[PDB]
């Protein structure tokens, strides 16, 4: 038989919509008193049971990201708090499936930001696939003690506390087959310095293209395409959205967005099913 | 024999500060309804008289940018209006100095947006220097009747209504001497698709580096550098600001920003005198 896709509900973040869809609200002399609004956006990860491997795409937040002794800086916690339930953390979502981190053959990190690489430290054996430039950038923020970005220096510290099976994607690598029907795509520079996507072909359905922050929501996707806020490389980002569209459409893959509330409702969480 | 630089006051625009310094205001859980604020930013152009040249850098807004049959689309008029006084237009500022458009040898367009290339149609003889990619972009918006950007379709129509002496800077061209002590710099892709700067050496002080929207304000310039909103190419933008800093500091030139209210107020205007 073929590939199984489990959707891991790793909670929510509460954030200004302007970060997610740039300039969705702004003041004007005509309408000078308007304010932007907070939205709650889903944090997720995807466990793929392949033929000959188990592959995890993304890892959510660190279970202890929030609080006075939390992983996230105090100001980060004020600005855009993780809001998820006690259950909504990757180690629990794995134990709920009968899995330890060690049972995962490879974990594909879309990139090394806060609510994507938060559980990297739980993986002492699994192959950790991340873009080489994403690795270089994360470790630089850590080495300089710079808390000003979505890279979490305290999380990075834990990643580096013990040797791990890092496998860094070269910036000129285009794609890698991870297993039959499972292709790792190197989106490269855009939202962050090195974005990775995962194409997963299924049996009852053609399958899914996992894109993470290469496209936050269906409203970013369009058409017309609409930029997120806080993009590292806007040109790379725009090019990557067009590539995502062409790749998925030519293959009838449904694109699964990084943080789309209404798509994430509608899915089917790992505690009560999987895709086949 | 010495170069003379005139500062031309071409009025002001009212606009949400979040466009000028990105994410200067955003909502959070504890401050869920704060509004951004409107700021008034100066629009300017620079006239350089040299022994064997008269060079203009930028051109302001079209004098008839606002109104029911104004050049600007209603959305722009409503959202970020021009609010300059009646005399604050390029033809008048030249008239005040006893000059006509045909007295200008060369007009250097920093780029081809609304409040920079608004008076290009007045120049039927002068050499019009613009980056080739910036020209290509502007025409594309006009050709598709696309009003959605800072490119003004109705101004571009007027530019194209008669042949003009366009001299387009190649993508790979680094710098051009326009006259002794006046050097055209090709900043390339960043704020828009092709940005041009102008280094102007004087006799009684080192001089000035005119950078237009490659750096809107001293706040963008820093340190620490802070990105503007609505940037075409954030990476090229970042590199351009670093290049501006290195170029100017190494030569002790004063960087004149695209829309810095405090800086502009400090400058001697063309109606009061000029720099030598
Ligand atoms: Zn991210
Ligand atoms: Zn994300
Ligand atoms: Zn501009
Ligand atoms: Zn401007």
Defining key terms:
homodimer; 276 residues; alpha/beta; Metallo-beta-lactamase, Chain A; six-stranded mixed β-sheet; five-stranded mixed β-sheet; 8 helices; 11 strands; 22% helix; 26% strand; globular; binds zinc ion; metal ion binding (chains A, B); RibonucZ/Hydroxyglut_hydro (chains A, B); EC 3.1.1.81 (chains A, B)
Question: What features would you describe in this structure?
Answer:
The structure is a homodimer of 276-residue chains. Chain A has 276 residues and is of the alpha/beta class. Chain A has a single domain (1-276), classed as Ribonuclease Z/Hydroxyacylglutathione hydrolase-like (Metallo-beta-lactamase, Chain A, 4-Layer Sandwich), CATH 3.60.15.10. The first copy, chain A, is built from eight helices and eleven strands. Chain A has helices at 17-20, 74-79, 90-95, 132-143, 153-160, 218-221, 234-249, 261-264, and strands at residues 4-16, 38-49, 54-57, 106-108, 127-131, 165-169, 175-179, 182-188, 195-201, 207-212, 254-257. In chain A, the strands form two sheets. In chain A, strands 1-2-3-4-5-6 form a six-stranded mixed β-sheet. In chain A, strands 7-8-9-10-11 form a five-stranded mixed β-sheet, covered by helices on one side. In chain A, β8 and β9 form a beta hairpin. In chain A, α4 (132-143) packs across α5 (153-160). The longest helix of chain A has 16 residues, at 234-249. Bound molecules: zinc ion (ZN) (4 copies). One zinc ion binds next to loops of chain A.
């Amino acid at each position: 038989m073929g590939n199984k896709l489990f959707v891991l509900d790793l909670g929510e973040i509460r954030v200004d919509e302007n970060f997610i869809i740039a300039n969705s609200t702004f003041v004007t002399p005509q309408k000078p008193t308007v304010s932007s609004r907070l939205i709650d956006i889903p944090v997720s990860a995807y466990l793929i049971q392949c033929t000959d491997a188990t592959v995890l795409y993304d890892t959510g937040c660190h279970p202890e990201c929030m609080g006075t002794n939390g992983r996230w800086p105090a100001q980060s916690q004020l600005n855009a708090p993780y809001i998820g339930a006690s259950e909504c953390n990757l180690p629990e979502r794995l134990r709920q499936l009968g899995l330890s981190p060690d049972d995962i053959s490879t974990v594909v990190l879309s990139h090394l930001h806060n609510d994507h690489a938060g559980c990297v430290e739980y993986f002492g054996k699994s192959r950790l696939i991340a873009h080489e430039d994403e690795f270089a950038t994360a470790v630089r923020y850590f080495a300089t003690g710079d808390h000003s970005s979505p890279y979490i220096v305290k999380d990075i510290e834990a990643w580096l506390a013990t040797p791990r099976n890092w496998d860094l994607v070269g910036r000129d690598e285009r794609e890698r087959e991870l297993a039959p029907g499972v292709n790792l795509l190197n989106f490269g520079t855009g939202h962050a310095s090195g974005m990775l996507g995962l194409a997963v072909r299924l049996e009852k359905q053609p399958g899914f293209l996992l894109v993470s922050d290469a496209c936050y929501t269906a409203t970013n996707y369009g058409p017309p395409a609409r930029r997120a806020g806080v993009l590292h490389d806007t040109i790379g980002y725009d090019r990557t959205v067009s590539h995502i569209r062409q790749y998925a459409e030519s293959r009838s893959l449904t694109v699964l967005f990084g943080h789309d509330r209404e798509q994430f409702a509608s899915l089917i969480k790992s505690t009560d099913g999987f895709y086949e």
